[PDB]
């Protein structure tokens, strides 16, 4: 009886208090676009890709952080929402490098895919782009930080999931940089997971580099035997060869993580 009634494009849904606008849309099968939000990390609210119009509210709200209020009608497809997404996608791509052919994320990139589904089809950015130094954080995770979109998922993962506080942001404004400041290796038994959570090609698997494209791999859902946890995994193969190991969600075992030995 604590549930409240809210609407997603006019369809009633009953949600418990504290549910965010983004979670309310999930219940009716609508996935709000996102970059910074991850359901297993602390809310950040910085990418602004989840902005959505509330009926009768002049200002768009960050669906990932805004608690839904009784009677709200969330318009996930209004011109106001669509123009907010196009504007944000435009800002994300202004300084992003033209790297898709040489970038391992290509073909399974949330920036590529959400640009196609929610962004414009052309550029009006007529300036030069930012370029960033690369950081060395060990032999497992390659960094191409010019591709970073400053979503801070890796920072929140390292702090909250891995319990390591080596990743942060240095500088301010457009020159704000994710990294370790000093020369430091992010060696944790869970370090490899920051490859998966990073939505772009900024963080990629060094062992996997350049070997395959996502569309050409075959997925075999399997189990890890590197320890006794029994982590669920996907074995990626191509033309009869194992290419990489990825996590497979299992809420009651490994959630969506795996150890570095498993990976």
């Amino acid at each position: 009886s604590n549930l409240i009634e809210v609407f997603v494009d006019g369809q009633s849904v009953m949600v418990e208090p504290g549910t965010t606008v983004l979670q309310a849309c999930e219940k009716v099968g609508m996935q709000i676009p996102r970059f910074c939000y991850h359901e297993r990390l602390s809310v950040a609210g910085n990418c602004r890709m989840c902005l959505v119009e509330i009926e009768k509210a002049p200002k768009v709200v960050a669906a990932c952080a805004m608690p839904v209020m009784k009677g709200w009608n969330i318009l996930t497809n209004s011109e106001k929402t669509k123009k907010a997404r196009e504007g944000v996608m435009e800002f994300l791509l202004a300084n992003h490098p033209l790297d898709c052919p040489i970038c391992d994320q290509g073909g399974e990139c949330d920036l590529q895919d959400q640009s196609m589904m929610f962004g414009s089809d052309r550029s009006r950015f007529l300036e030069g782009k930012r370029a960033v130094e690369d950081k060395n954080i060990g032999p497992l995770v390659k960094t191409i930080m010019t591709r970073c979109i400053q979503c801070t998922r890796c920072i929140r993962f390292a702090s909250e999931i891995a319990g390591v506080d080596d990743l942060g942001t240095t500088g301010r404004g457009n020159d704000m940089q994710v990294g370790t400041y000093i020369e430091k290796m992010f060696m944790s038994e869970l370090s490899g997971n920051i490859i998966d959570i990073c939505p772009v090609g900024a963080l990629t698997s060094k062992p996997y580099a350049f070997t395959a494209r996502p569309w050409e791999t075959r997925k075999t859902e399997s189990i890890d035997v590197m320890d006794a946890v029994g982590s669920n995994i996907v074995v990626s193969t191509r033309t009869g060869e194992v290419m990489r190991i990825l996590p497979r969600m299992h809420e009651d075992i490994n959630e969506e993580w795996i150890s570095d030995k498993t990976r």
């Binding site: 130094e133 950081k135 506080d165 080596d166 990743l167 942060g168 942001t169 240095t170 500088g171 301010r172 020159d175 940089q177 990294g179 370790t180 400041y181 000093i182 020369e183």
Partner: protein, 214 residues
């Protein structure tokens, strides 16, 4: 410096000697007691600033020492050090000249002030004199816009400046004397030049105009 990554050098590495003096350790104690227990991290900014006052600038060893004293991860101290512009992560000159070039000061010819300083010291913006006595940088609004054009040297504002005035100030500094701060034009603070347009009557005393019932 201009970069926000740290590379160790002989002059700046984890082994570069830094420690708080016994007197600064007493100041740190009073700093830390201004905040609730369980929230010592609130003291990072003032303690980091204290390390810079003792040392002049912040070597990476000083950042590590602050992180150790307050028991916060060192990375959370690097973020503060690189976020805030008053922390010097490279050595600066004895006198850090900071010229405001934002629009209100630009409208009153802050450029002529900047051009005068460069000529007298023979350096460019962002340089240190070979004496290591002066470092020159441009800054954003310093909160003295009605007294433009103005500069800050260390903790002191010098205001209502002309090219002659800033040159006189630098000569005093080069001669080992700290000049008086404040406007150099004739007025004392923020009053309009050429007489007060307000607050010319003696201020009223206690209880003037008090409402009934108090």
């Amino acid at each position: 410096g201009a970069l926000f990554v740290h590379r160790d050098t002989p002059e700046n590495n984890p082994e570069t000697p830094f420690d708080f003096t016994p007197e600064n350790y007493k100041r740190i104690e009073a700093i830390v007691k201004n905040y609730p227990e369980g929230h010592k991290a609130a003291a990072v900014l003032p303690v980091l600033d204290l390390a810079q006052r003792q040392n002049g600038w912040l070597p990476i060893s000083a950042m590590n020492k602050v992180a150790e004293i307050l028991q916060v991860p060192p990375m959370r101290v690097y973020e503060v050090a690189t976020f805030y512009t008053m922390y010097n992560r490279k050595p600066v000159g004895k006198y850090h000249i900071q010229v405001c070039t934002t629009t209100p000061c630009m409208l009153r010819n802050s450029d002529s002030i900047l051009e005068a300083i460069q000529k007298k010291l023979g350096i460019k913006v962002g340089e240190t004199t070979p004496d290591k006595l002066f470092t020159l940088i441009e800054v954003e609004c310093l909160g003295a816009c009605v007294n433009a054009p103005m500069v800050q040297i260390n903790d002191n504002y010098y205001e209502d400046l002309t090219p002659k005035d800033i040159e006189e100030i630098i000569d005093e500094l080069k001669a080992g004397k700290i000049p008086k701060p404040g406007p150099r034009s004739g007025r004392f603070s923020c009053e309009p030049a050429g007489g007060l347009t307000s607050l010319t009557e003696p201020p009223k005393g206690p209880g003037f105009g008090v409402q009934a019932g108090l």
